[PDB]
Design a binder for these strands. Sequence first.
RNA 1: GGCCAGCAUCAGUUUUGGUGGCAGGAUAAAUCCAUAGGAAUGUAGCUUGCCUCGGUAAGUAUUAUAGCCUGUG
RNA 2: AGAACUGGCGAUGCGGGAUGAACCGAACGUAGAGUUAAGGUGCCGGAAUACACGCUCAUCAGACACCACAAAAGGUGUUAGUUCAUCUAGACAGCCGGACGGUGGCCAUGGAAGUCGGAAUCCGCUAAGGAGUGUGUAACAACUCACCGGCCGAAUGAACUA
RNA 3: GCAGUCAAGCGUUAUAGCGACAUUGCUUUUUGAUUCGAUGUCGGCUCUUCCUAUCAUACCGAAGCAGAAUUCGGUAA
RNA 4: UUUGCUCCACACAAUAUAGAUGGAUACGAAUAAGGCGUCCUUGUGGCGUCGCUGAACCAUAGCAGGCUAGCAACGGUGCACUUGGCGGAAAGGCCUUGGGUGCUUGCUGGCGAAUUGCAAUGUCAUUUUGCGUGGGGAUAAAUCAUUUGUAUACGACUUAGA
Lengths: 171, 191, 234, 137, 197, 72
Amino acid sequence: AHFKEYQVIGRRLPTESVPEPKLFRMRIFASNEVIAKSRYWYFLQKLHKVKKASGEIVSINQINEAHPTKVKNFGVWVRYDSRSGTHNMYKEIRDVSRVAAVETLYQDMAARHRARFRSIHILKVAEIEKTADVKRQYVKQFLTKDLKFPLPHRVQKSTKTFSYKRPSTFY
Amino acid sequence: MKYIQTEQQIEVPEGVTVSIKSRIVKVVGPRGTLTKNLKHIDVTFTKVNNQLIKVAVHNGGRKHVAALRTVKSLVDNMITGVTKGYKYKMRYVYAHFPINVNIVEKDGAKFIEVRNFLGDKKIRNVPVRDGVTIEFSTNVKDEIVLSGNSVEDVSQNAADLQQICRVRNKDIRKFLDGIYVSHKGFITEDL
Amino acid sequence: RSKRSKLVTLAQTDKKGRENKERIFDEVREALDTYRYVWVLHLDDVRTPVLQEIRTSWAGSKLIMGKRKVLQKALGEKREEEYKENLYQLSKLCSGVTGLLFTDEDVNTVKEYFKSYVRSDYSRPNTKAPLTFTIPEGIVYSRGGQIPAEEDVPMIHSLEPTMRNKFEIPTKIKAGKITIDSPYLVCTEGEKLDVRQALILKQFGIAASEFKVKVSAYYDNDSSTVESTNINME
Amino acid sequence: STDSIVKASNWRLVEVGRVVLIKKGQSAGKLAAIVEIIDQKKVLIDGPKAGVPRQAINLGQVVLTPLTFALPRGARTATVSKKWAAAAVCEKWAASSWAKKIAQRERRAALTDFERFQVMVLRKQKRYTVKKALAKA
Amino acid sequence: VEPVVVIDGKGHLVGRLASVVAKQLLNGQKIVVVRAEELNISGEFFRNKLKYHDFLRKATAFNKTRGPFHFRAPSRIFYKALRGMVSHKTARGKAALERLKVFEGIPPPYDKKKRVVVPQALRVLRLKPGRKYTTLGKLSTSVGWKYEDVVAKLEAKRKVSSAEYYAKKRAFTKKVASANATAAESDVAKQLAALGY
Amino acid sequence: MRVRKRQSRRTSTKLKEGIKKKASAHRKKEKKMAKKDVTWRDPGIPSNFPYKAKILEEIEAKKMKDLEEREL
RNA sequence: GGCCAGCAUCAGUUUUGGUGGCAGGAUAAAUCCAUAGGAAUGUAGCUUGCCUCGGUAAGUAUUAUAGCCUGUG
RNA sequence: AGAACUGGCGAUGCGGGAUGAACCGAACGUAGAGUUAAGGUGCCGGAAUACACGCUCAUCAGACACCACAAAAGGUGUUAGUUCAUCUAGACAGCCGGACGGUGGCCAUGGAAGUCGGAAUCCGCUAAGGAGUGUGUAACAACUCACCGGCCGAAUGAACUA
RNA sequence: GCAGUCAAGCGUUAUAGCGACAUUGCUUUUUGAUUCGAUGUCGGCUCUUCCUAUCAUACCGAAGCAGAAUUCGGUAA
RNA sequence: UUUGCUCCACACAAUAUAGAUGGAUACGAAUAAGGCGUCCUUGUGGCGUCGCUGAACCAUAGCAGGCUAGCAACGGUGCACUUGGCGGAAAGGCCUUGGGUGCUUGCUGGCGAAUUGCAAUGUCAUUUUGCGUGGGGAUAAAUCAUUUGUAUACGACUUAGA
Ligand SMILES: [Mg+2]
Ligand SMILES: [Mg+2]
Ligand SMILES: [Mg+2]
Ligand SMILES: [Mg+2]
Ligand SMILES: [Mg+2]
């Protein structure tokens, strides 16, 4: 869906002679908290030897974009599954929010790499502070000073079946 | 990748005027006028000054920008044609049967007539395309000269003349007769 | 897809890297310490036997060639980057194919040698024609009339496509011999030559031009000054 | 008359300071200004005078106008409001036939039955005068 | 909104125009399609010619006069596309089909009637620029239609007459607008502008 | 211009059911061979990621800290 | 009073709108305001080269005759 | 192919998969109203020629079963990635110039000079230059390219993955 | 076909195991010398049409293709 | 075949069924371009303006639209004649001249409307192979039977006969 970002902090259940276990935090992109908790337990089992029956969710909190109306360039480092192994990928996405960039990335993976949400792992989403560190041409072409471009061949939607004039594509 | 904008530049010399409206290019120079229809390609022409004309493609792909470079080359060829002209020199050689090349008028249509090619009784007729002139060279043996402002017309007429004398059912390592383009250049030879 | 495919060769000599440039750099900087006068020489279109004869004549000195940017970096490009004082002027005086002559010989001896040294050279393109050349009518020979045809050898038939296409000389093959129906003018005296005319002169082997080693300036270690010499710089 | 002529084909340009009219959504029919370009299909727009929130929008949800005013790239809402006020975008928009056509359409939609009757009466009077002036010459 | 709708088929895509026309006929609208030779099919001419030749391959083996009938005219190509989208073997489908007429060119009385277009079927509004398309007159001539030149000559004569009519109409429109502009400063005009007219 | 016969793309019920049975048999055989056969069984930081130096410094610092944290 | 209807007030089931009061979260994040730093896709100014009467290319110059980013409040 | 368990079907209609023994949904009194499942919403045909981000152009694309054809093969189609390298002491293309000396290295041959062959394949001078990458000669010549340099001025090349 | 050899890959940190393209041995050895068990369906006549996987006719490409003739191949029913 | 056939005006009588209920309201071409207005040296010309839908335009008030009185203007429109021109793609329509006769809501007045009872399509639009009034116009063929053989199984075909 339209993604949200959460922090999920969990731990192993306290036991006698092992009190106050360590707390582990993840940043999870998910449509809702049920999906976020499921993804947290998946990643926690994949990294540590912690199971859902053996642990508990201490906290889950939605993280909002700090400046949602500022245009940003994001470098997205992702890892996807293959039969030979796990392969890295680095994409650059220009958008105004981390969740918007992540949704764009998931749509691009579904279009191009034929990939799915369960197979795609988001390793890092990092804002590029200086434009000199941007190294994808499809992002760099929009960083030009005094950027102007037209929109030729405008197609106007019609509300009626028949039109009494020949249409124009001027803009 | 969808490049935002891709452009090429076209340089116009002093005596050449260019008029472009809805991708119909007219180029007028000292040697005459040429006209080209480019409505099969979606490009935009802009005039910067009397010496520079830009042609651009917006939000285009690889095939579109290849077409852009092709368009620039075509307009450059038209300019070169109206300012210098094109001149293709062909030579015709034979082993035993002298090839006879004449200019005839068939209801005022200017054909090139080729006789005795390898002793054939057939008369080969190549029409002269409009805008090109055919001259038989002075003090050069068996040389034809095709001149015109249209390199396309001149080169196609030369190719038709070369192909009308194909050697059939003979070893071409041995039978060397034919009409061959010997030189390509410009009509102007001032320097 | 749809890209040009690189042609593949199987030869012995491989490309040189940055290590060769570093070696040349270090050699130039060490010769700067070792020798007294550094002379900048213009040696464009020099033939290797001529250059090696110059090296043999200058036994005891060091002649170093290489990329001009490498040489200027070794000498120091700017005033804060110069290897020695007042060397940036010598470094910026390097232009074209530049050689460095490190020596301890006399300024008079260097000037006298580079004024009195000259060799016969091919007429390069964009130069002046030293003579008027005309290929005579009939059978074309190897020298093209520069020697009597009774002593000369006929031109090989394999060169006729080159003469007809690349040289644009109207030629025919008759009984395995190259022939021209009319005498052909190749060059006129005191005229600028192009690539085609220079190639025709080289193919016929005519070498009437002169090769002279140009000298731009020199630098002295102890004085730390650069003096323009202007030898063969007309 | 020995100079080249090439047809301009003047397009409206997606650029900072380009004024757009939002044609669908919460802010339908309102003017906004382009503050920053995101990509070929999305821009950042801000409409503080008309009440449009600063938002990222697809270029297919807006229509470009021939209006443009000088604006720094990435300008915040206060700067956009100040530059919009200084350039007087609203008056120049309202003076155009596009906005007049929109206003006429809204007025005709707002007319009552009695006002439609009055429109018919006035149209017949104007028709009488216009036909009389047309026949005399 | 009109008893008969006349559609200028020039520059329309055959499948989408056929779909909209079939739905209109089944809903009960009377439709006349003119200039069927100027219709468009997406895809290159050799592709569409190959498709028509496969259709030409289709025929009943033991008697060719019983088989599928291959009509070469552009209006009949469009009619085949329409009949494929109408359930033509039922009485309702036959009645819908009889609310339609298709013509090459514009014969009388339609040459003096208003002609409309269908935006969702228009080539310049639907196809991406650079995509190749076929013209129905050329396709029909390649597959055996023999009245391409006659339609062209009659259409040229119609265009001459229509241009003369439009010149007169434009002169009258200019005169009417001139007379209407000098009444725009009166009180009736001000009241009409206040009411939106 | 003689157009040939085009291959039909209408689905055959018998062919589809046979393909289903063939696929199930293939899956069972692949699973059996994977269980039976004998065969011995991290890409790191992408080079285009801009903060490679920062990631490397962080992982080195964490390694050096955990070197003494678990010891004492 | 037999046949077919219309409206009003209700009940049961359901469908489709308008609008009000609350409560949570980083007691939303933002916008906005103030304050302290910073930089370029460098604003004003200054210098130079030489250009259509000052409109450019390259150096400088961190808010000035535009603005932006970050931290805190 | 043989065992063990569990489903479905025969005795069973209904919605969908165009059509159907084993597929998807759902099991059945007679009706009304509402909502849905599976499957769909260009027209046949009830339902958006909806919205959105990408990809693809097929001289019989595809709208499929995910098995086979299938060698994860071929392609100067196109898109996105991964890893290596080269680069303002100048990247890739292009043009021009250099491409040397012992030496026509030894044997062999009527002839064989880097280039019909068999074995050495070294040294010097170099910025670089093979006891030669090919064309060519009866042998030479000549051209080339391996390598180097001048002009040009900013990104490029290779191998893999999807 | 059987038995090997090589290794572009695949696999691995135990230099195991799979493995395309190539390649060897046997069948088959040097002077162009000198019929062996179809256990159950087959041929004709007349006459039509289809496929192309083309023998001829058409047009092409290559080849020590001089000419003549022929070989290999392309489009083509 | 007890005056058959056929067009023009006038009264009656019925009649309008894939679905009337203000009007199908006429440039062509392009769309990486056009429309309109205007000026000039008339063009691939300069300048201005338009689009972002027909949400338009034209029509549209009056017992389903009655009966009358005036003001202004010489316009608008219906009907029947009539002058001239154009249209052959299936023209069957388009434009126009003049007189006549109506209406005019462009503006201001005077009367009428009811009871269809609180809705019920509440009936309103061209063509009339039917009748009765009337003025002019024109008075045929085909088939069977007979016959030919350029034809033929039979039909059919092809000939001839007041
Ligand atoms: Mg109720
Ligand atoms: Mg429907
Ligand atoms: Mg097969
Ligand atoms: Mg074949
Ligand atoms: Mg009244």
